[PDB]
Ligand binder design. Structure first.
Ligand SMILES: Nc1ncnc2c1ncn2[C@@H]1O[C@H](COP(=O)(O)OP(=O)(O)OP(=O)(O)O)[C@@H](O)[C@H]1O
Ligand SMILES: [Ca+2]
Lengths: 566, 146
């Protein structure tokens, strides 16, 4: 039976669970080909990479499996959402710019239906819009590199002098008009594609908090987190489970805590008043109300809309895109505001995002160190203010209107602006101490100033920022490597599986694979409860009851049967 | 072969051979390979430095014109702020080197106007492209050899 097995290899899927017998058991099922085809999507793979990096790095071993199941539940959502896709200086400048661009690209009633037809096109190709936005920013900045200023019009006039060629002048206008549009398209695509994910995540988290805890009924709201408070404005809406599957989750909370507490209070907090109507709805039949298309559609939950808008604006990625919008719009103010876009995009290739994040990764000590430097420089300023007045001058003949020692403010500014820079402390920018008075009382001042705020303090500050970037690189390398020496499911490493050739590939490709469970979770959904086998219902019951004992966690079919099968 | 042959063109082309050979003792071949061992991030970092210097150039082009001059009496034909190209070249060629940013090669900000609007410019220029960016670039090449 080799041929049939080979044909059916890419469909059968093995997982391993334990339970009700305190021993490891095997499971088998069929993986629908459409799910496998939709598994290798550009968004899904990167989401998996981000999830695994977050889980391994941010500490686990206690909530790890819970986060795994949560990620499965979320990824099912955009697996669903993917359905809606059915149809001289110039010579140097050009050479250098082309090199920079090349490496970046190497690593970078019935009439209303047409509106949806055109709008669904944006979601299909969204990344290319951002690519085009970066390209337009690059081109417009390179064109900007040719400006000039004259004291008279061709009162200063920013007249743009092109080269001998008279072209490329209106190209700036057309590109400026085009960039705003191709960024607004990005905004619309994001508003159409990604926000369902975050909305669904928040809805699911709130539903879990209400079902398995009484944080909003039993004890008290946390009243200390904006996320934990802004959500109080949606509990009263009639359409709270807009995107989560459990669209009748309101029943569970009242059935679990509506007796120990005021049943009327519970049935009034969650909206849905007069629960008698809800109970009696499923008594006679299911009536079909007449459609009110384009007549009463205006009547929508104002509270829910406000809460959704708050969730939208509290996000960071959408806010960043809106910032891009506003800067692009302000660009048409006849200015260089287009020069602030390259940045935001340039930081797209990680190896630069890690550098940008290293600045604020360890800033909590950086600000203290900066303050310490400031107070030390101030200490030296007050030391030298009342002792060394006659030295701080700029050596002007026959008159000295400039003295950086008279006022304390000017002296402090002069020290903080000159002494820190320079090579060597304030011994290179003031009068020579060759005079007999205070010579040995100022040589030591110069030496200790050069030794305490230049060769130590600045060294420490430079060390803090540079070392944090190294730490980030090490963290990424470790998160890449650790997963290559463990299984993320088994509680054991590769050493014991390496006693046989290709042992780890065998333990990761046909046994628990971190993807077989993905197919298992949505395979359980399709098959009705009446057809579940003797184990499918077993795991499904715990999954609905949120108990993760069925993951192996320590041994996978081999430690149990070493003697019988070696 | 071809460089040796071109050497007989009555030139110093023989001065380009020592190199290739000098790098025969490993302890130097590893140094030569360290430059391109981790270049995939080195080029990105260099690009980041270039865009930051350009950002400062456009910031100071339309605000601090009257400072960038070479202090010639009775005439100032040389102004490194008029054209964007010359200003960018001047920044990228002078400011990066030097000890301290562009505060040692331009006019004093002692004038009342924009004094506090340029002291911070000098300080942040010295802090963002000298004590961090160049430090990172030097660190990348040296650490790869290690
Ligand atoms: N329990 C595990 N589940 C999955 N992969 C594992 C496991 N343990 C180790 N690995 C390693 O991880 C690899 C797949 O995970 P990874 O995150 O690298 O996937 P990827 O980036 O999509 O690409 P590729 O599958 O080609 O490696 C396996 O080929 C194997 O080398
Ligand atoms: Ca049955």
């Amino acid at each position: 039976a080799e041929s049939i097995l080979e044909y059916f290899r890419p469909y059968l899927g093995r997982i391993e669970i334990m339970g009700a017998s305190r021993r490891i058991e095997r499971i088998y099922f069929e993986i629908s080909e459409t799910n496998r085809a939709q598994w290798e999507m550009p968004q899904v793979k990167e989401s998996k990479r981000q999830f695994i990096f977050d889980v391994v790095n941010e500490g686990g071993e206690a909530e790890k499996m819970e986060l795994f199941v949560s990620f499965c539940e979320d990824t099912i959502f955009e697996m669903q959402i993917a359905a809606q896709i059915s149809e001289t200086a110039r010579e140097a400048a050009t050479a250098l710019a082309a090199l920079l661009w090349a490496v970046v690209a190497r690593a970078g009633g019935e009439l209303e239906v047409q509106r949806v037809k055109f709008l669904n096109y944006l979601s299909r190709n969204f990344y290319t819009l951002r690519f085009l936005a970066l390209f337009l920013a690059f081109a417009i900045n390179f064109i900007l590199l040719f400006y000039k200023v004259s004291d008279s019009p061709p009162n200063m006039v920013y007249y743009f002098l092109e080269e001998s060629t008279g072209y490329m002048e209106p190209a700036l206008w057309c590109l400026s008009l085009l960039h705003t549009l191709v960024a607004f398209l990005c905004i619309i695509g994001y508003n159409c594609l990604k926000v369902p994910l975050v909305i669904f995540k928040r809805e699911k988290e709130l539903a879990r908090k209400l079902e398995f805890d009484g944080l909003y009924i039993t004890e008290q709201p946390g009243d200390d987190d904006v996320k934990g408070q802004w959500d109080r404005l949606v509990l009263n809406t009639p359409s709270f489970p807009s995107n989560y599957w459990d669209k009748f989750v309101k029943r569970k909370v009242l059935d679990k805590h509506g007796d120990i507490f005021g049943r009327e209070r519970i049935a009034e907090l969650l909206g849905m008043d007069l629960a008698s109507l809800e109970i009696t709805a499923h008594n006679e039949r299911k009536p079909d109300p007449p459609p009110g298309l384009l007549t009463w559609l205006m009547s929508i939950d104002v509270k829910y809309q406000i809460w959704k808008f708050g969730v939208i604006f509290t996000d960071n990625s959408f806010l960043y895109l809106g910032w891009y919008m506003v800067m692009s719009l302000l660009g048409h103010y006849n200015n260089f505001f287009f020069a602030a876009h390259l940045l935001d995009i340039a930081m797209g290739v990680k190896t630069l995002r890690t550098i940008l994040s290293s600045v604020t990764h360890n800033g909590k000590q950086l600000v203290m160190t900066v303050g310490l430097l400031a107070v030390v420089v101030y200490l030296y300023t007050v030391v030298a203010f009342n002792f060394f007045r006659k030295f701080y001058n700029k050596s002007e003949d026959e008159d000295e209107p400039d003295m950086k020692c008279d006022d304390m403010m000017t002296c402090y500014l002069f020290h903080m602006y000159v002494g820190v820079r320079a090579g060597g402390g304030i011994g290179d920018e003031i009068e020579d101490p060759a005079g007999d008075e205070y010579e040995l009382y100022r040589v030591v001042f110069d030496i200790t100033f050069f030794f305490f705020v230049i060769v130590i303090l600045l060294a420490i500050i430079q060390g803090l920022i540079i070392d944090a970037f190294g730490e980030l690189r090490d963290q990424q390398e470790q998160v890449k490597e650790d997963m290559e020496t463990k299984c993320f499911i088994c509680g054991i490493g590769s050493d014991y599986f390496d006693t046989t050739p290709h042992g780890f590939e065998t333990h990761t490709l046909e046994e628990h694979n971190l993807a077989n469970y993905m197919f298992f979770l949505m395979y359980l959904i399709n098959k009705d409860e009446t057809e579940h086998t003797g184990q499918e219902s077993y795991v499904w019951k715990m999954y609905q009851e949120r108990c993760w004992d069925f993951f192996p966690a320590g041994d996978c079919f081999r430690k149990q049967y070493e003697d019988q099968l070696s």
